[PDB]
Design a binder for this molecule. Structure first.
Ligand SMILES: CCCC(=O)NCCCC[C@@H](N)C(=O)OP(=O)(O)OC[C@H]1O[C@@H](n2cnc3c(N)ncnc32)[C@H](O)[C@@H]1O
Ligand SMILES: [Mg+2]
Length: 267
């Protein structure tokens, strides 16, 4: 008797990318399930006995070390931010990204991106730090989404940026290139052909967007008291993990009660 679709869904929760076993080979569901539960328990036992690190926390520490070693100051800014920051980001109440925002009181929301706090740090630190100013933040962001294959409602962003001298497209591409080759993630940078000043580049892994990146200046800068050249990029940590570990579903890389380091916790 063939596996039912529900049975197949159950086994896939338990399946790992490198398991390499035939789901079409005559063996009953109960035995296939029992073999996989056994392997997944072994995986959790190995982690507990040896490393004990969460993939998301560990990616965060590896990324932090990378950017600190290259001259970028580590920022930890509020996750709960004023709603006014969203409007000041040019997201008017008509825009679709405006529908994706988790509001908290009359006045606050969960940040859907790192840019507003980074803009404020850029302006402030410009009164104290020598040119160029190099900063980054890693942390949670929130968007109400309409999909769930590559999009989470709760995700983790890395954003880095540089302001002042050296803010070129070539330098932006070089830092992105060094970063992803350090992590061992394959990519290609796509952008408009002959664009110089206000460019937007996407960093792609096949059809999956890893990052969008910007070469400033852009008109929105003046709303934040910024009047210097800059470069920057934002990367989703869960998309990076999904590519690195070859997860079929991004939920396996998220903050979760259902998966730990890509392994089902429902054993
Ligand atoms: C002052 C300095 C500002 C600065 O430095 N600006 C340039 C940075 C632009 C970036 C910034 N402005 C930005 O938001 O873009 P995004 O909405 O395309 O998200 C970027 C990445 O986050 C991930 N991502 C986005 N939404 C999701 C989601 N629902 N689930 C998982 N990952 C996601 C995904 O990897 C995506 O490519
Ligand atoms: Mg985008």
């Amino acid at each position: 008797p063939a596996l039912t679709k529900s049975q197949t869904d159950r086994l896939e929760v338990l399946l790992n990318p490198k398991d390499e076993i035939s789901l079409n080979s005559g063996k009953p569901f109960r035995e296939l399930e029992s073999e996989l539960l056994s392997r997944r328990k072994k995986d959790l036992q190995q982690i507990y006995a040896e490393e004990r690190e969460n993939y998301l926390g560990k990616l965060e520490r590896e990324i932090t070390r990378f950017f600190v070693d290259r001259g970028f100051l580590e920022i930890k800014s509020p996750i709960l931010i004023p709603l006014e920051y969203i409007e000041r980001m040019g997201i008017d109440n008509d825009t679709e990204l405006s529908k994706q925002i988790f509001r908290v009181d009359k006045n606050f929301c969960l940040r859907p991106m790192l840019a507003p706090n980074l803009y404020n740090y850029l302006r402030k630190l410009d009164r104290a730090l020598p040119d160029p100013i190099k900063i980054f933040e890693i942390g949670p962001c929130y968007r109400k989404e309409s999909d769930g294959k590559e999009h989470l409602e709760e995700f983790t962003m890395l954003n880095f940026c540089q302001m002042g001298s050296g803010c070129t497209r070539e330098n932006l591409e070089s830092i992105i290139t060094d970063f992803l080759n350090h992590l061992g993630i394959d990519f290609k940078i796509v952008g408009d052909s002959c664009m110089v000043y206000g460019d937007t580049l996407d960093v792609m892994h096949g059809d999956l967007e890893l990052s969008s990146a910007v070469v400033g200046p852009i008109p929105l800068d003046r709303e934040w008291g910024i009047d210097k050249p800059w470069i920057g990029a934002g990367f989703g940590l869960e998309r990076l993990l999904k590519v690195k570990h070859d997860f079929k579903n991004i939920k396996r890389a998220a903050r979760s009660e259902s998966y730990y380091n890509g392994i089902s916790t429902n054993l």
